[PDB]
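Thread: Modeling a multi-component assembly for a lab meeting

Hi all, long-time lurker, first post. My supervisor asked me to bring a structural picture of a complex we are working on to next week's group meeting, and I have zero experience with this. I have the sequence lines for every component (1098 residues in total). Could someone generate the structure of the whole assembly? Inputs are pasted exactly as I received them:
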Amino acid sequence: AKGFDEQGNQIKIATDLSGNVYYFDASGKMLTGVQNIDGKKYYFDEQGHRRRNYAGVFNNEFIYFGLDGVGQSAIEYQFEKGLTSQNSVATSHNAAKSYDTKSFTNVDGFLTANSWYRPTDILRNGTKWEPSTETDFRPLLMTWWPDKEVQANYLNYMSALGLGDQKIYTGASSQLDLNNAALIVQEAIEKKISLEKSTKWLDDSIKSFIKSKRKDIQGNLVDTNPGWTIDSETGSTNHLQNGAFIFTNSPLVPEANAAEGNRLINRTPSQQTGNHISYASQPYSGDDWGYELLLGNDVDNSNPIVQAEQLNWIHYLMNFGTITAPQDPDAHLANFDSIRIDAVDNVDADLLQIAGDYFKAAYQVGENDKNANQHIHILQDWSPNDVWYNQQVNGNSQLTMDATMQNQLLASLTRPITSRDSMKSFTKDALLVHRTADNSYNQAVPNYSFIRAHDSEVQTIIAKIISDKHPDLYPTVDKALLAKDSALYDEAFTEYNADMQKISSQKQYTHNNMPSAYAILLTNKDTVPRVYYGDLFTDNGEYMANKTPYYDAITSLLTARTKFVSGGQSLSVDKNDVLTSVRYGKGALSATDNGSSDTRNQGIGVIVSNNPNLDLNNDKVTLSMGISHAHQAYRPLLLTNSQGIVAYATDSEVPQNLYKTTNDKGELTFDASEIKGYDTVQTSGYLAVWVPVGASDEQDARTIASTEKNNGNSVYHSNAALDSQLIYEGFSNFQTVPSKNASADEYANVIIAKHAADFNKWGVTSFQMAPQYRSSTDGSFLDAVDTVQNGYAFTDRYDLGFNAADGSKNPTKYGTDEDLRNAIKSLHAQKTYDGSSIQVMADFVPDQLYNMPLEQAVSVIRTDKYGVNSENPDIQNIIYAANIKSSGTDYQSIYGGKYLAELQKNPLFKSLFDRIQISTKKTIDPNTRITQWSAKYFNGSNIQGKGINYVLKDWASNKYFNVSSNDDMYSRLPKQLMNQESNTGFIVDDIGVKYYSISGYQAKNTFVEDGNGEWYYFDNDGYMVKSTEESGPLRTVNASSKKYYILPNGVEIRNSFGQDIQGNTYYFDARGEMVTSQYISDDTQNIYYFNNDGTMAK
Ligand SMILES: OC[C@H]1O[C@@](CO)(O[C@H]2O[C@H](CO)[C@@H](O)[C@H](O)[C@H]2O)[C@@H](O)[C@@H]1O
Ligand SMILES: [Ca+2]
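Re: Modeling a multi-component assembly
Sure thing. I ran the full set together rather than chain by chain. Output:
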């Protein structure tokens, strides 16, 4: 393949479309082998290509062709020969006062880049060496660095702050110059310190140096110290916070090691046993979407001491009043009643049983409906299989969510017209509870159903808006949940709120048909509905301060549910796709049922279409109420017209003409004159609700719980009593956060108390409050940004808003502990239809803790959210300074495990404590108290961006510095810092080459990278490994089965092809290791295959 130029076809510096560099001799023949061009040697393979990073003997010359494609003599040493002493006049002075904990700021003995130490003397005001006081600490990085590049970067950085030599240093620069320039930098530092009377400025500029960034040869900002930033913590992205560590044991860090057979990750309901078990049958799915590492620092709920602490916590919540306000004689009225188990799919399912046991023990919930229905818990179980795990395995100790209902309501009603399912879908088979002919009790699986929630169908709508406005910063919805700038939310919200006010056909972001959905939800049989604050009030702004467009319609339904909704049910959808849901009224379970005395004035009927151009065209819609409703007058509760939805609240508000009367089969019959298609803010399609005329004020459709003893597996039973319950989720993420000096009546828990009667009027029986735990403000996630401190991101699980130490009121987002106790008392003081108090639900959040105050050394592996090793070589059981230890002066320390001694002694709890837990196969363990959270109680954590090499360590010895131990497994301090002889560099010897780190220690059994960039290895004897003629270049070095290619000068080549003296070719990856049974892509798009042997294919 000759090479011709455009102007003329000459060959005598030729290129190719791939980049391959041919050079043809005079007259057009390509050359191969070793060639000399302009006094440089260049290697051309047998294909003709000029090649870079290629090593081999050619004509009895070992030549390494570098990135240039230019030969270097492998025999000649490529390192600087000579040592350099690290002892100077000042090292006697800068040496540590003492070589122990008292003179070094440290992490479990280990050191980090932000370690400060106490020298024996201070250069006071840069002019006189004085003995250092106790407080005369200086940053380690002022006098010591882990290698020359960091020292160099440090020198230039300090100089750029006016504290230095205005000239440029690099790892190329000499060891002795860097040391002398450091001293000049030290004078300037110390003069600044005398002037300011402070080192905060210095701490600030050392901290900011570490994370500093740099322009490079390419011209883009890199990290100046990659090993000390998140940049170095690379692995899988599949975790909400872009990475995750698993804590693992290691002899270097004895106190962070967990016991044997703890840290059982992924014990989700489906996989509690250790293996998936589909509990689901023919129509239903048995999938599990769970995973152990969700957010923040992951509590290990497979540890039995932790499990007991989870119990302890539930007891504390259920007795929060009596515990926190003993002097108060009404303390017993300020206790939580129920729990919401949170992130069920992200914790050991053993907790679901721990909790079920507790309520059987404390409140005897197992004996009947009356007791069971007095404490209604709910699971946050998203996975399809959990519904059936809950039933078969877990009794029904907590209520499962009906997600088939939620998704159907969303797909058939809320979507835009393009995306929307048919109303027929409501009669389908995959639905959890068949309602076409629901005519029994105690058959359905007990469940709560809802449409939206603080998280579900809210925070993701907001995040989509942020992402669509700033794709460059946040390109997905999951990544937008990490947005922290209050400006970004305000902006998104003015859009969100504006969209909600728009007609349905122009609703670009927010849900359609919300009242229509709520009409079906609130009139459905066999479920406990949950209402989201944000469907009555706006998701943002002040608590209960602004109504949505749906408030009238939804509140109308909510009160109407109280009066009319009872009895059997039937759903239909006529030829026109118009849904008709009917409740027959109490005492009547079918359309052919004559009923009781209660039936006549009860039993609602609902009409829903989802088609904005519904044109009946001589067809009729029919509401078959019962034969128990024949010849009966009916009147509307809700109706849609072009202005919106009308809500009639009494018989007398209805104009007489709108009344209409059933025929003899109890059928209502609607014309095209009545039902048509619409497009408003609140309805695309039609909506109507009809109630029977003549109901009384006394009338209440609900039913009292049975006292009869239940000998069943399930705690709850889907019947009339249970359908009489309703849950109201009483909060939003984006409620405005009462500012520091907010007046007392902004706080949501005060507002709650005021409006207590309103919730009772709506039929609320279980008030689901927000989590009450004081929030982090670190913005590591949505829940923890300061403009939404919702309480799912906390450090102290026992602190629900206590006053400060000085006795100043110091609230949470929602109010003080006082204000909470009162909120509970107000709700408790309200009494529902059966005379009993409105329940108050605690958010039980066992999964994680955010934002802990103290560091601890731990061993880590880089993984994804499921726990799967991301297989980063440099993050395999390494040591990390993790923020993972609680203060030990927090409320955890007071109340942690406090009641376990008390609870064991109780006879009623014997079952609970004696119970063998499924995943642990051991019982719960209440004999240890948890007053300080430590790393040993955590499965792992999200990546904290400290850096891999944040924990300091000597490259030559390859051990970690440790100031608290003298054990050999750690390196002792740098010889310079303890005023001993210390030299650094490569030193050639009659036997071979040794190397001493900047710390003064000998390289033994390690790889070492030169300042020039070449790697070298040092054997057990402390000598460089180097191939000889007797021993070829292809070599194992460390009993690892890993072959490297080491030239005669000791250079261990990387990202490079190497040769046998025989003629075979091998490729050595980024880590210098030989490649085997694989294809290699070249920069110029050439492909090479390497066999299992490691040889290149041909
Ligand atoms: O919020 C994101 C994600 O987490 C889930 C897990 O069930 O929500 C629960 O757990 C989170 C951390 O505790 C909280 O943000 C959230 O408020 C809580 O409901 C999912 O609902 C959600 O997809
Ligand atoms: Ca977990």
